Amino acid sequence: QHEKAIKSYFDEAQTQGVIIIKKNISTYGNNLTRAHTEYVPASTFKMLNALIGLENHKATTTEIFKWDGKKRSYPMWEKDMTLGDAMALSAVPVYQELARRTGLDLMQKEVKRVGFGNMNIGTQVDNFWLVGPLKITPIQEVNFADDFANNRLPFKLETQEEVKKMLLIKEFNSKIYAKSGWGMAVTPQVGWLTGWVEKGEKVAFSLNIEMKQGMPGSIRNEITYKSLENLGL
Ligand SMILES: [Cl-]
Ligand SMILES: [Cl-]
Ligand code: NA
Structure with a gap:
């Protein structure tokens, strides 16, 4: 029942995707091989970037990251903003600045300690999550999300709770925490939620879809929500 319904949400969007639900993992959608395929994390990596940066005192939650006036890829990012603002806007250049502060050596050590994806950040500290070589499967993302939900990541409890505040996206009565991603600089493009x-109880999820040229970002939220509702939320 649920399997057919969720598959149809992806089919009707005329693209391929999967959604992982998590101690047991279930996979739904029209291309379940994607669950076992690694992709760039894109802006989903901001969760971990923020954890590493706050834990190691590279930023505070009240700090403003100033726009130095150079044009950015989106005018919505051409403003001064906090890490939490930048999380909500997926403001890459703010998190690139944070990554540079952390630096390649500390970033690589923390990524390996967390075990995030293939754990390979390569040599370029400020774009490895956008173009590779760091890649992660959707099942790996759901396991990261489940650990985060349970404060099981190797960071202080307070650090984890500070970053969660930046990710709380819906409250209704229960809560939904989530981070979107869109790898636009790889081909095909990858979409995440x-x-x-x-x-x-905590139920972790990870939607992973091929973003066809011109698809709206909202398709990620739309399929995810419809899937969770079909499953009973
Ligand atoms: Cl506050
Ligand atoms: Cl570059
Ligand atoms: Na990032």
Whole structure:
């Protein structure tokens, strides 16, 4: 029942995708091989970038990242903003600045300690999550989300809770925390929505879809929500 319904949401969008639901993992959609394929994390990596940066005192949650006036890819990013603002706007240049502060050596050590994806950040500290070589499967993303939901990541409890505040996206009564991603600089483009529902049970999810040229960002939220509702939220 659920399997056919969720597959149809991806089919009707005329693209290929999967959604992972998590101690047991279930996979739904029209291309389940994607669950076992690694992709660039794109802006989903901001979750981990923020954790690493706050834990290591490279930024505070009240700090403003100033726009130095150079044009950015989106006018919505051409403003001064906090890490939380930049999380919501997926403001790449702010998190590139944070990554540079962390630096390649500390970033690589933390990524390996967390075990995030293939754990390979390469040699370029400020774009490895956008163009590779760092890649992650959707099942790996759901496991990261489930650990985050349970404060099981190797960071202080307070650091994890500070970053969660930046990711709380819906409250209704239960809570939904999530982070979108869109790898536009790879071909094909990859779309992500990774997070969890807090009902006291926690249910983690990761949607991974091929973003066809011109598709709206909202398709990620639309399929995710319809899928979770079909499954009973
Ligand atoms: Cl506050
Ligand atoms: Cl570059
Ligand atoms: Na990032």
